[PDB]
Design a protein around this ligand. Structure first.
Ligand code: MG
Ligand code: MG
Ligand code: MG
Ligand code: MG
Ligand code: MG
Ligand code: MG
Ligand code: MG
Ligand code: MG
Ligand code: MG
Ligand code: MG
Ligand code: MG
Ligand code: MG
Ligand code: MG
Ligand code: MG
Ligand code: MG
Ligand code: MG
Ligand code: MG
Ligand code: MG
Ligand code: MG
Ligand code: MG
Ligand code: MG
Ligand code: MG
Ligand code: MG
Ligand code: MG
Ligand code: MG
Ligand code: MG
Ligand code: MG
Ligand code: MG
Ligand code: MG
Ligand code: MG
Ligand code: MG
Ligand code: MG
Ligand code: MG
Ligand code: MG
Ligand code: MG
Ligand code: MG
Ligand code: MG
Ligand code: MG
Ligand code: MG
Ligand code: MG
Ligand code: MG
Ligand code: MG
Ligand code: MG
Ligand code: MG
Ligand code: MG
Ligand code: MG
Ligand code: MG
Ligand code: MG
Ligand code: MG
Ligand code: MG
Ligand code: MG
Ligand code: MG
Ligand code: MG
Ligand code: MG
Ligand code: MG
Ligand code: MG
Ligand code: MG
Ligand code: MG
Ligand code: MG
Ligand code: MG
Ligand code: MG
Ligand code: MG
Ligand code: MG
Ligand code: MG
Ligand code: MG
Ligand code: MG
Ligand code: MG
Ligand code: MG
Ligand code: MG
Ligand code: MG
Ligand code: MG
Ligand code: MG
Ligand code: MG
Ligand code: MG
Ligand code: MG
Ligand code: MG
Ligand code: MG
Ligand code: MG
Ligand code: MG
Ligand code: MG
Ligand code: MG
Ligand code: MG
Ligand code: MG
Ligand code: MG
Ligand code: MG
Ligand code: MG
Ligand code: MG
Ligand code: MG
Ligand code: MG
Ligand code: MG
Ligand code: MG
Ligand code: MG
Ligand code: MG
Ligand code: MG
Ligand code: MG
Ligand code: MG
Ligand code: MG
Ligand code: MG
Ligand code: MG
Ligand code: MG
Ligand code: MG
Ligand code: MG
Ligand code: MG
Ligand code: MG
Ligand code: MG
Ligand code: MG
Ligand code: MG
Ligand code: MG
Ligand code: MG
Ligand code: MG
Ligand code: MG
Ligand code: MG
Ligand code: MG
Ligand code: MG
Ligand code: MG
Ligand code: MG
Ligand code: MG
Ligand code: MG
Ligand code: MG
Ligand code: MG
Lengths: 99, 96, 122, 82
RNA sequence: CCGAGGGUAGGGCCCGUGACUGGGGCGAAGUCGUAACAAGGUAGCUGUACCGGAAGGUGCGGCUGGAU
RNA sequence: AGCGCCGGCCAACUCCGUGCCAGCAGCCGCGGUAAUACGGAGGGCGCGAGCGUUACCCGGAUUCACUGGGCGUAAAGGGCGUGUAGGCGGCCUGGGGCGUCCCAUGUGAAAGACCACGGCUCAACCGUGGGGGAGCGUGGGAUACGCUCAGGCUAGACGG
RNA sequence: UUGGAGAGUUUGAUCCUGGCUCAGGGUGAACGCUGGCGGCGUGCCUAAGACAUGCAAGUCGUGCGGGCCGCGGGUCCGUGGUCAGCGGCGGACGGGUGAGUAACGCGUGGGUGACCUACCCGGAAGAGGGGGACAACCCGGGGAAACUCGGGCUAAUCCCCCAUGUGGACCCGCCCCUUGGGGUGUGUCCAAAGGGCUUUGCCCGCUUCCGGAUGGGCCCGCGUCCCAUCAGCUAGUUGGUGGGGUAAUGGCCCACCAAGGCGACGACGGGUAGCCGGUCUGAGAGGAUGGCCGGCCACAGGGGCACUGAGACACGGGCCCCACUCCUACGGGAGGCAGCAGUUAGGAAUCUUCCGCAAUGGGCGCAAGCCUGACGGAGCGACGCCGCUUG
RNA sequence: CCCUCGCCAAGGAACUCUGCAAGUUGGCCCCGUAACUUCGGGAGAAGGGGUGCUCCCUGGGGUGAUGAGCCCCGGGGAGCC
């Protein structure tokens, strides 16, 4: 099937495109423990209906642009700005990891 | 120091001529009709546009155009002419 | 009309790019070298790992010059640069290719090997 | 065309073919589409020939082309019997 | 138009090498002393600072991983 | 029929020669006039159209430790707080079923490896059959625990 | 539950910590001493340095017209061989190598309503009528060769033109679907080549369409080494609109617009490496590895480029630039073994300039058959394993 | 012959105590710019591109009035010698 993923929109600042962050868990292949890893997908939104904070599903799709190979499947939840915080604060810490 | 690969290069040069010549014409005509369709001039646009389409499919008989190119050139040819005549109408022949 | 201080292009593949004339080998006090004349030169610029390197004092035969050379048949020929081919003491090129045309004058002066290796002779 | 033929296994002075369906453009002993039987030319065992007959008929229907010396080992197992 | 590359000019990283120079390892058949190990003959060690041929010394503060 | 070895590790011991020399050496170490440790010899041990050396890989190495180590004095607690991300988190009830677990099914090529048999006089080599797998897709299920959402609590925490 | 041994060495002695060392298995090996036979393997790991000579891709006269020779016998016809040429089909496979690449390259599972597929098979229908070019050959000029210039003529399964329309293509509307999927209506557009025999019948070809099969392109999830003494990176950059391009999606390319995209879950940078099935070891977990065999990729003296084509941006095809070498008659030309052997350099070190198309396989052909350094075998080497001898 | 001045083949500092003298460079706009640093600078570093005229489209300002005219600061396209 077309791969389907669920995540938070962290950017709406492109026209007709959202950045959807998809998260996942898996055991460490040696140390066993369950670990999280995340990844941003540029998802096609022809309708500019998806907002910052939406939790959405995206479905692998024929390529729309370089880097966009997913369209937005549907709304799941709205107003998860707490997730968007988690991401945004993390990027803001990066200014403090340099020299 | 020899080969019939020579033969095969000898031939490619000749097929190259026939091809290029065919493709040249298609663009000359398509653009001609598109030009007409802009200032349309509807009967004439349509008239030349037919001459194009014929030549395109003629090219798709051989190695010149793969069928889908012919399809594609035709599709874009037609779309342009029609939508151009929308800025004044109306279709004097066919078509369609 | 090459004289001490004149920079010449080197038209071979010895690795030398540019040489500065330091002497014209034509008797005790010749003022100028032309086509077919041998100079002694300093290597002022060379590419890495060639037969010859910057600082080397080499010999070279001038093979084309920016001052036109005149001919007994009333004509003259003129090149866009002054160029020389590096040689050894038996007037043989130390390189194995020569780039650009050379002057036919080279032949009558026994730079036979250079004359043949040359893409053109004018 | 896709072909039905003889991939040599076994070893030196010791042939052992796998009658097999593969693309003609493959190398002899290369990845084949499907195995459908074997053939010991030196005949050194009771069944020096085995052929799934039900299968070979499929590929033929669908356009496979057997080699000469495979056509035979298909005759011998009567894949051709009308 | 783009374009292999060529040419001009200025940058970045890396390797090799260099008069001379800084210590380091080692060797051991030397010179000078004897700083540490005993209260090691001024308890030692310490961060820092100044100083001395050299181990080192002294000052300030700290530690006991100090004998009596 | 050769090659290595015979101080210990490590299986195999005596004579001569030498005298901190000549030399051996993987580690520990042998040699300074009675050396099973050097060189030869007799003898012995080990393998055998081979034996031995050098190089490199894994092993022994739980000596990077997931299985399976550690940090007062052996190497090892940050000079001390505050705190971002992260990692982790009390009792009770439900909803969801992401982790997790089970069943089905597709995939998991061939060769190789593993078990059976068989062909080259054996074997090596080679052939025929068998056994599976992790891991990913699909469908169905479970809901203890971890997760998530929702509603309660007071033993943690904070406040009066 | 088929599976797990340890020893020497820090002290006068002890216990502990801790490093060094050894016994084991392995190899594309190499070196020494020694060396009889056979089988299966197996053999340039270094300079992806440079290469003398042969050979590694051609085939069909059942597409065509010609010369040259001969056989047949009354200038010509026939028939045969040969040699080009025009015309197919192959040459994109098969063989080499591992340079580059840390990437959707590979592995694994998926997506294509975004796609192609020669020859092969199944099924639907069809081959009417005209005209033309260029070689070969004749004739002129130019070279030492490579070689070519121009004038003229002639055939065809070569090229073109109209006709025909099962069908197919394209725009617009409509219905089902749901990314560009399937059907329909109007308009427009597109087919063809014949050869041969036993000759009112076959065979091989030719044409357009549908579906199969097979091989591919593109796309996505997850996996894939060392250095953070590399911490910030990005202007076709990230998205958009329109268009160009392709078989097809896509900043793949362009024009315009917006200000975005990425990064401690390690971007960017440097280094190293083709990846897998596997292999080796290890009780296992792990570690190490990718030679031979199979799968994929990449490359073809170093670069760029497209032509031809179903398919190539083509190892033994083309164009251009570079480096190098050679030939010459000194005017001018040629080449690309990382195909098989072979030479040289380098190195501790790695093979016969063998034989054959008999077998398997591939190409062309109705077929006989021709070619095949793929392959089948033979040669050298104790390189490995296995067997056997010196009783 | 001297002064002040213009040009010069090939060369290009070989002149001389010394490039002395004379060349070169040269405004503006844009790109771009190193060591080192007292973080200001070094900097106009260096180096490079542009520069005329014609036509067409177009942005902002001043004065008007909000418009015309006038004046100011531009942008994009196609051309000509
Ligand atoms: Mg787009
Ligand atoms: Mg041919
Ligand atoms: Mg034109
Ligand atoms: Mg076509
Ligand atoms: Mg084409
Ligand atoms: Mg120098
Ligand atoms: Mg450029
Ligand atoms: Mg450049
Ligand atoms: Mg160039
Ligand atoms: Mg020194
Ligand atoms: Mg020194
Ligand atoms: Mg003291
Ligand atoms: Mg003392
Ligand atoms: Mg004291
Ligand atoms: Mg002190
Ligand atoms: Mg003193
Ligand atoms: Mg003092
Ligand atoms: Mg204190
Ligand atoms: Mg031994
Ligand atoms: Mg032993
Ligand atoms: Mg013993
Ligand atoms: Mg002695
Ligand atoms: Mg003795
Ligand atoms: Mg010993
Ligand atoms: Mg002894
Ligand atoms: Mg052990
Ligand atoms: Mg371990
Ligand atoms: Mg080890
Ligand atoms: Mg542990
Ligand atoms: Mg420990
Ligand atoms: Mg300590
Ligand atoms: Mg503390
Ligand atoms: Mg601190
Ligand atoms: Mg927190
Ligand atoms: Mg949590
Ligand atoms: Mg809990
Ligand atoms: Mg719950
Ligand atoms: Mg679940
Ligand atoms: Mg399974
Ligand atoms: Mg298998
Ligand atoms: Mg048996
Ligand atoms: Mg088997
Ligand atoms: Mg198993
Ligand atoms: Mg529950
Ligand atoms: Mg709650
Ligand atoms: Mg409480
Ligand atoms: Mg000791
Ligand atoms: Mg001690
Ligand atoms: Mg002792
Ligand atoms: Mg120990
Ligand atoms: Mg040997
Ligand atoms: Mg020997
Ligand atoms: Mg190699
Ligand atoms: Mg070299
Ligand atoms: Mg060489
Ligand atoms: Mg041959
Ligand atoms: Mg035919
Ligand atoms: Mg013949
Ligand atoms: Mg022929
Ligand atoms: Mg290949
Ligand atoms: Mg091979
Ligand atoms: Mg490689
Ligand atoms: Mg990299
Ligand atoms: Mg990936
Ligand atoms: Mg993938
Ligand atoms: Mg073809
Ligand atoms: Mg005719
Ligand atoms: Mg027609
Ligand atoms: Mg742009
Ligand atoms: Mg588009
Ligand atoms: Mg293509
Ligand atoms: Mg791009
Ligand atoms: Mg990440
Ligand atoms: Mg890191
Ligand atoms: Mg590199
Ligand atoms: Mg490499
Ligand atoms: Mg172990
Ligand atoms: Mg590897
Ligand atoms: Mg290897
Ligand atoms: Mg391989
Ligand atoms: Mg390349
Ligand atoms: Mg190339
Ligand atoms: Mg090469
Ligand atoms: Mg090339
Ligand atoms: Mg080719
Ligand atoms: Mg090529
Ligand atoms: Mg390629
Ligand atoms: Mg190939
Ligand atoms: Mg080749
Ligand atoms: Mg000549
Ligand atoms: Mg030429
Ligand atoms: Mg050759
Ligand atoms: Mg040598
Ligand atoms: Mg060889
Ligand atoms: Mg061989
Ligand atoms: Mg054959
Ligand atoms: Mg055959
Ligand atoms: Mg055939
Ligand atoms: Mg042969
Ligand atoms: Mg002058
Ligand atoms: Mg001048
Ligand atoms: Mg100068
Ligand atoms: Mg100058
Ligand atoms: Mg001077
Ligand atoms: Mg002077
Ligand atoms: Mg001066
Ligand atoms: Mg001055
Ligand atoms: Mg001036
Ligand atoms: Mg001026
Ligand atoms: Mg001035
Ligand atoms: Mg500087
Ligand atoms: Mg300065
Ligand atoms: Mg500064
Ligand atoms: Mg400037
Ligand atoms: Mg300028
Ligand atoms: Mg201009
Ligand atoms: Mg003016
Ligand atoms: Mg003017
Ligand atoms: Mg005023
Ligand atoms: Mg105004």
């Amino acid at each position: 099937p077309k791969k389907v993923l669920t995540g938070v929109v962290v950017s709406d600042k492109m026209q007709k495109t959202v950045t959807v962050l998809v998260e996942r868990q898996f055991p460490h292949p040696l140390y066993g423990k369950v670990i999280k890893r995340s990844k941003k997908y540029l998802a096609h939104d022809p309708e500019e209906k998806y907002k910052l904070g939406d939790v959405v599903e995206i479905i692998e799709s024929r390529p729309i642009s370089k880097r966009k190979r997913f369209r937005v499947l549907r709304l799941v939840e709205s107003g998860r700005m707490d997730l968007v915080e988690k991401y945004l604060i993390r990027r803001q810490n990066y200014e403090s990891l340099s020299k | 120091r020899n080969l019939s690969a020579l033969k095969r290069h000898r031939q490619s040069l000749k097929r190259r001529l026939r091809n290029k010549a065919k493709k040249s014409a298609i663009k000359t005509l398509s653009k001609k009709a598109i030009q007409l369709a802009q200032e349309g001039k509807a009967e004439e646009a349509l008239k030349i546009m037919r001459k194009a389409e014929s030549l395109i499919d003629k090219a798709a008989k051989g190695s010149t155009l793969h069928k889908n190119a012919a399809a594609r050139r035709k599709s874009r040819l037609m779309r342009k002419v029609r939508q151009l005549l929308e800025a004044a109408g109306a279709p004097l022949i066919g078509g369609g | 009309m090459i004289q001490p201080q004149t920079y010449l292009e080197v038209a071979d593949n010895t690795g030398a790019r540019k040489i500065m004339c330091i002497r014209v080998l034509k008797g005790s006090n010749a003022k100028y070298a032309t086509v077919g004349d041998v100079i002694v030169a300093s290597v002022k610029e060379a590419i890495p790992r060639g037969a010859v390197k910057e600082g080397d004092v080499v010999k070279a035969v001038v093979v084309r010059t920016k001052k036109e050379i005149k001919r007994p048949d009333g004509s003259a020929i003129r090149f866009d640069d002054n160029a020389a081919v590096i040689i050894n003491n038996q007037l043989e090129p130390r390189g194995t290719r020569v780039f650009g045309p050379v002057a036919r004058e080279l032949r009558e002066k026994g730079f036979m090997k250079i004359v043949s290796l040359a893409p053109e002779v004018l | 065309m896709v072909k039905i033929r003889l991939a040599r296994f076994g070893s030196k002075h010791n042939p052992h073919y796998r009658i097999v369906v593969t693309d003609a453009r493959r190398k002899r002993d290369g990845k084949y589409i499907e195995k459908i039987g074997y053939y010991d030319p030196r005949k050194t065992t009771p069944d020096w020939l085995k052929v799934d007959v039900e299968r070979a008929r499929y590929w033929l229907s669908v356009g496979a082309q057997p080699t000469d010396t495979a056509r035979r080992l298909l005759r011998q197992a009567g894949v051709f019997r009308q």
